[PDB]
Ligand binder design. Structure first.
Ligand SMILES: O=c1ccn([C@@H]2O[C@H](COP(=O)(O)OP(=O)(O)O)[C@@H](O)[C@H]2O)c(=O)[nH]1
Ligand SMILES: *[C@@H]1O[C@H](CO)[C@@H](O)[C@H](O)[C@H]1NC(C)=O
Lengths: 674, 14
């Protein structure tokens, strides 16, 4: 194809269509710079060649030249205002840039021009999901399902991304099939390297009896992945394991990256090795026994590495809440609550069970200042109106007279001169004050005091004050929260929440501007459900530490059934906040119930929507019961396995050895569910 | 967060 094309150019250099076709093929091959040369020839030969501009824009996009891509799409549309593809491509630039209203407008233009346009319709559907625009929602869902069905039948890559497929009422069969098609994109890409299969280790002799485990991630740095597992590499037992971390991203300068680089036995920066064949060779050279895929179909993934099968056992872990659908992945690390044996068919991988939950979080290490708290009695005694946290909080409390200890142990500071000064700082919006030599910080001002503490890179070194007044929350009412991105909400979920709010007069729902353009849509739908504006309170997204800390102000978290809080679920639990959940069928919809089961709070898991409402309302109205459940969460976040990274790592190690012994005995992968 | 950045889980390009 390429050698034939080049000959056609050696024969006839002024062949615009040919240049543009040769560029496209080169693009597919990953030879982006070479492709650029030919697109440029095409547009010189014919200044009105809109298709070439559009395709050139695609190439620039892949080269990470977003502004250049936008310029190309813009020229294409100027040359041909009715060019539907170019409008859709422009919309994608707007989308990826975070400008959803502009994306929506451009996709709508694309669909006006070409009503049968799966990529544009499905991308528009995701935009609408992001901002909670549920206009014609039921019909939209039906159309998405119909589009996927048609594309699968016709052997075309589906327009619904596998990560997004969790959000739509697709069958498990369809969801797995979408994932499988993406798996195949990877196989096709590496097939062209014509690399032979790798010879894999058959024992642990060359590694001195240690199992060599490779963790592959684009998220070793400031990203949820590291916020969950950054302690795990350093907790592996060096007598039995040798840990290799393979980074798909450059060093972002954060302490998260520092920690993993310092604690892994080996750290390899594959961001410096763009070729998947060479990168796979490097992994194979290291002698990895179990290679762990921490991306799945998420940003930064290089699943081509796994398609090349450099290791004898390859497992999905933690980073992607779904199946890879890919034959080159052997196992998915999960648990009996998240992925009961009954639904093994939803997954291409064999199930490998951790004993409690597969979920983990680094909160005990990142946010140890939240292990204990004190309150200020600004009047009964509340545990979530005015809260103090700090490594040195006990010493501060010991410097005060008349501190009362409330038992069920929560220290309570009485309304005195000290308490007034703390409250005045908050009311005045002051950054910090000093009391008895101790540093007392306004929890809204962490970035001005220590920006590394604000992001979770360092433990705060001051005592922090958190109050309902900082966020405009009522002092005399129940606060239900949900701190997820708004895309996780659907009409049925908001209706449930409205039903709860109507049954609990003295209550509000606390949501985030995530993004802010979703706020007006949620508010309109709430109003249509008969809830006045003041029943729902919005706050901005906050730095990581403030986000986890402020969860202490809520009474109850109402989890999203469509796709649960994952990281976000761990965050809320660490603050001691009960979370009500309704597990569904997909992995993404069952994570919160798995977290709660490990924690030991079965009473917070609902079997259906009526039970979810009833549980939420009981917590909001039976105040002794609320005190009991909050007490249970507060204690069990410490005593349960949920946040115990050492225990988790040890259980992971047991699982790895089971996988290895199974392979070493000559067996192909099978479920590890006992 | 406004004035900073809050990384989240998101899909890869296709
Ligand atoms: O005000 C906020 C709300 C959320 N987060 C963080 O934002 C990320 C949200 O990512 P994602 O939506 O992918 O979370 P998940 O699906 O895992 O719950 C998590 O790391 C949260 O801790 C934050 O730092 N500040
Ligand atoms: C976000 O990332 C975390 C850690 O990688 C992962 O556990 C979680 O499932 C992701 N969220 C979604 C909805 O993909």
């Amino acid at each position: 194809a390429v050698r034939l094309y080049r000959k056609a150019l050696e024969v006839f250099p002024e062949f615009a269509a040919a240049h543009s076709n040769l560029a496209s093929v080169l693009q597919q091959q990953g030879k982006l710079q070479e492709a650029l040369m030919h697109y440029k020839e095409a547009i010189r030969i014919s200044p009105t060649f809109a298709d070439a501009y559009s395709n050139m824009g695609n190439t620039l996009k892949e080269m990470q030249d977003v502004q250049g891509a936008l310029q190309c799409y813009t020229r294409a549309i100027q040359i041909n205002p009715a060019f539907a593809d170019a409008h859709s491509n422009l919309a994608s630039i707007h989308k990826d840039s975070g400008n959803i209203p502009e994306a929506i407008a451009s996709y709508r233009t694309a669909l006006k021009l070409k009503p049968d346009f799966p990529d544009a319709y499905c991308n528009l559907a995701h935009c609408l999901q992001i901002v909670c625009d549920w206009t014609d929602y039921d019909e939209r869902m039906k159309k998405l399902v119909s589009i996927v069905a048609d594309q699968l039948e016709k052997n075309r890559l589906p327009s619904v991304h596998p990560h997004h497929s969790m959000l739509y009422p697709l069958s498990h069969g369809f969801r797995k099939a979408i994932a499988e098609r993406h798996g195949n994109l990877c196989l096709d890409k590496i097939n062209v390297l014509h690399k032979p299969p790798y010879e894999h280790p058959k024992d642990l002799k060359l590694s001195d009896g240690r199992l060599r485990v490779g963790y592959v991630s684009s998220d070793f740095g400031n990203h949820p992945t590291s916020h969950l597992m950054q302690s795990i590499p350093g907790m592996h037992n060096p007598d039995k394991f040798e840990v290799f971390c393979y980074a798909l991203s450059p060093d972002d300068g954060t302490n998260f990256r520092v920690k993993v680089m310092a604690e892994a036995n080996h750290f390899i920066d594959l961001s410096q090795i763009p070729c998947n064949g060479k990168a796979a060779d490097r992994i194979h050279q290291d002698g990895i026994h179990i290679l762990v895929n921490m991306n799945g179909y998420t940003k930064g993934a290089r699943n081509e590495l796994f398609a090349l099968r450099p290791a004898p056992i390859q497992a999905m872990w933690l980073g992607y809440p779904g199946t890879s659908g890919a034959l080159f992945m052997d196992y998915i690390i999960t648990d009996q609550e998240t992925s009961p044996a009954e639904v093994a068919e939803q997954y291409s991988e064999k199930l490998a069970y951790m004993p409690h939950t597969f979920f983990i979080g680094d909160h005990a290490n990142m946010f140890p200042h939240l292990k204990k708290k004190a309150v200020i009695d600004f009047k009964h005694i509340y545990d979530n109106r005015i809260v103090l946290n700090g490594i040195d909080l006990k010493a501060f409390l010991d410097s005060l007279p008349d501190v009362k200890i409330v038992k069920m142990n929560m220290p309570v500071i009485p309304m005195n001169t000290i308490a007034e000064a703390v409250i005045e700082m908050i009311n005045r919006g002051q950054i910090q004050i000093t009391i008895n030599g101790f540093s007392i910080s306004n929890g809204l001002a962490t970035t001005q005091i220590n920006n590394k503490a604000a992001t979770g890179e360092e433990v705060p070194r001051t005592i922090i004050v958190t109050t309902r007044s900082q966020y405009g929350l009522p002092e005399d009412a129940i606060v239900y929260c949900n701190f997820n991105q708004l895309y996780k909400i659907d009409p049925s979920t908001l209706q449930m929440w409205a039903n709860i709010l109507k049954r609990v007069p003295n209550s509000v729902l606390w949501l985030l501007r995530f993004p802010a353009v979703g706020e007006p849509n949620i508010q309109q739908y709430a109003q249509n459900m008969g809830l006045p504006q003041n029943r729902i309170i919005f706050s901005p997204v906050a730095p990581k530490e403030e986000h986890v800390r402020r969860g202490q102000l809520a009474d109850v978290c109402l989890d999203t059934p469509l796709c649960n809080g994952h990281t976000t679920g761990m965050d809320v639990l660490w603050a001691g906040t009960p979370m009500v959940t309704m597990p569904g069928e997909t992995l993404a919809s069952r994570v919160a119930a798995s977290q709660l089961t490990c924690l030991g709070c079965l009473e917070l898991i609902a079997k259906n929507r009526q039970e979810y409402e009833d549980i939420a309302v009981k917590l909001g109205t039976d105040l002794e019961y609320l005190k009991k459940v909050r007490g249970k969460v507060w204690k069990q976040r410490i005593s349960s396995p949920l946040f115990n990274t050492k225990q988790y790592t040890m259980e992971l190690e047991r699982l790895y050895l089971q996988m290895w012994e199974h392979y070493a005995a000559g067996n192909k992968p099978d479920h590890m569910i006992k | 967060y406004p004035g900073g950045s809050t990384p989240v889980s998101s899909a890869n390009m296709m």
